[PDB]
Amino acid sequence: ENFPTEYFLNTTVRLLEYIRYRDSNYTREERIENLHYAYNKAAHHFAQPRQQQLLKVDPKRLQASLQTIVGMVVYSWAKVSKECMADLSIHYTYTLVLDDSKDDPYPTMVNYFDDLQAGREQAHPWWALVNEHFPNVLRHFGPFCSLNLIRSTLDFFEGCWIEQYNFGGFPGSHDYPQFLRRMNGLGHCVGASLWPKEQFNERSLFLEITSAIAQMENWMVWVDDLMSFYKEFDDERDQISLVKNYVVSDEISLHEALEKLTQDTLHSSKQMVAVFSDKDPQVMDTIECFMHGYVTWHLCDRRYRLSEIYEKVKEEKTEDAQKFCKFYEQAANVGAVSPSEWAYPPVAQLANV
Amino acid sequence: ENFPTEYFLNTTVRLLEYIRYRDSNYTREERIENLHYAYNKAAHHFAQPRQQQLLKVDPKRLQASLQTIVGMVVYSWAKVSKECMADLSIHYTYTLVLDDSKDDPYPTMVNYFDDLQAGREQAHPWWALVNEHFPNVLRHFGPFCSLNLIRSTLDFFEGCWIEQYNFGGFPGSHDYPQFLRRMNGLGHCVGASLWPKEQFNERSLFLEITSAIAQMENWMVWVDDLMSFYKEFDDERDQISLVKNYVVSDEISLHEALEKLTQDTLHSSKQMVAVFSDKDPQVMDTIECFMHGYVTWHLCDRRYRLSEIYEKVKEEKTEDAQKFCKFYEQAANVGAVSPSEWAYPPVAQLANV
């Protein structure tokens, strides 16, 4: 009934300690420069007439979606170039936006393969925009990493299709929940997009990169699920989250579902550190900066409402409460930025022009 | 080292006993009918000069691979049409060929996306043949199932790429083993290819089909990991396997890995029943025919050399050796068919003509 505040607090602090969440050389001024650069290129992109006409999305939602994504990319893909941040920001905004569509994909997918093989534009307008823009993203990567982004985005499309059914799985279908989360998680897209060929040699680091994808896929989706647990707790609109599907498919209490998620998240966090600590320094740096930035993004983006938790235990003398607050303040310290400092002008204004 | 023959018998018996292995998908006459029909069409396809030119494989290997796959398809896709069996046999023969192949995809995947988007033939000859043939397979399915086949085949390609490095994962990279197995397992391709639109309405059974894909993906791969353990054990190309990757990645004994696998496999089997038992009978039927036929195929087909094991423990007085031999005999009774009764003429002969 009530939110598991202490249990949530303990797990979150454990998660941050396990990943060695600490300060970086990534400054606020640098952040702002990156945020504005990525926002500005993406904003001009989505403001073009073709994009404005084929991408069915409410203007205010697009604006909010773009801002949250730019934040996610600039903060988590800390080592990539500005161009790479901008181009990845566009791709991930396309993916987030597809979740606003309730339109049945069936009719637009009947000739998917034949049109693809023939080089004809796809019937589904989202595929038309995404496949047209894709090269701007792939140009930053080698063939192996590119193949991964392509596959993950294709999986994501199928995941959105499945979700239109608002199905959490048949009771007893234990393998359904993760099958769905992987399908919609963009794990291999995220995992592989951390290695621009400009900074990494895909062939020389094949093993570390392949391993990063395998481990980051689960780390990223589970951390998102865990940190989204507070905002989703009482959301009666959101009915098929991973945790909620665990309840339905595994026939267990929400608490047990949360326990499952916590165990997987903490273990994933430890093996991440254990495996990459001794590997190539540049690789460990990218992985570590992703984890930290990804957490900071969740802590600083209003969408997750975690400030509400910080505000509820801000004066408790509990160990976890105090540790959570210190971490939170650390995050806001470098992540709490006013949108007026980078996200301007609005996409709709550039669209009218 | 030495093959855990003793434990191999223990696990195999447990699985067969739990699923209650019993193949009754065909009369001997029907089985021969389908095998020949599928083989004959596939044989004429692979004998075409274009196919002979681009598919780089030793004639004897192609021949042996085709017969192994015709058996897999006919034996497990018992409810689909002869045409579907044939077209699926061609597709899965392309994949098995790549499955044992040793090539570097890298150079021919550099312009993969751009060529795909422009409708230009792919540089990698395998993709050139597979994508050209694909429509003959997809015409049997609705858009959702088709999308699944496409994704799984693309995943499979990446899977074989990774295997080229003979990497079993970094010690402690717990997520690597299954990451790779799903990547190379063709799970969604197999699971989705069980629902031809001629017999099933993709929209009326969307949930059961999605569920079947999710659950069968793991049953399918795990069952093969267990049963194909023998032929892979000492094969250089198969040293990177789920079982052997569990050892390296999770730092555990081959024994523990096998027990882990069989436990998963038994659980997967249990939920398959629990979930589909009381669902649409036509769906349950296709699922049952696949599970039993899939096992029959592993016990009879050459590729898995399970006869060799039979010819060694047949005399042994162990209880497992007796259970295994009873099952092996039961499977041969229905599945042991002479190639001379259906696999003719040889591909090579049709090619020279």
Ligand SMILES: [Mg+2]
């Ligand atoms: Mg394989």
Ligand SMILES: [Mg+2]
């Ligand atoms: Mg193989």
Ligand SMILES: [Mg+2]
């Ligand atoms: Mg195998």
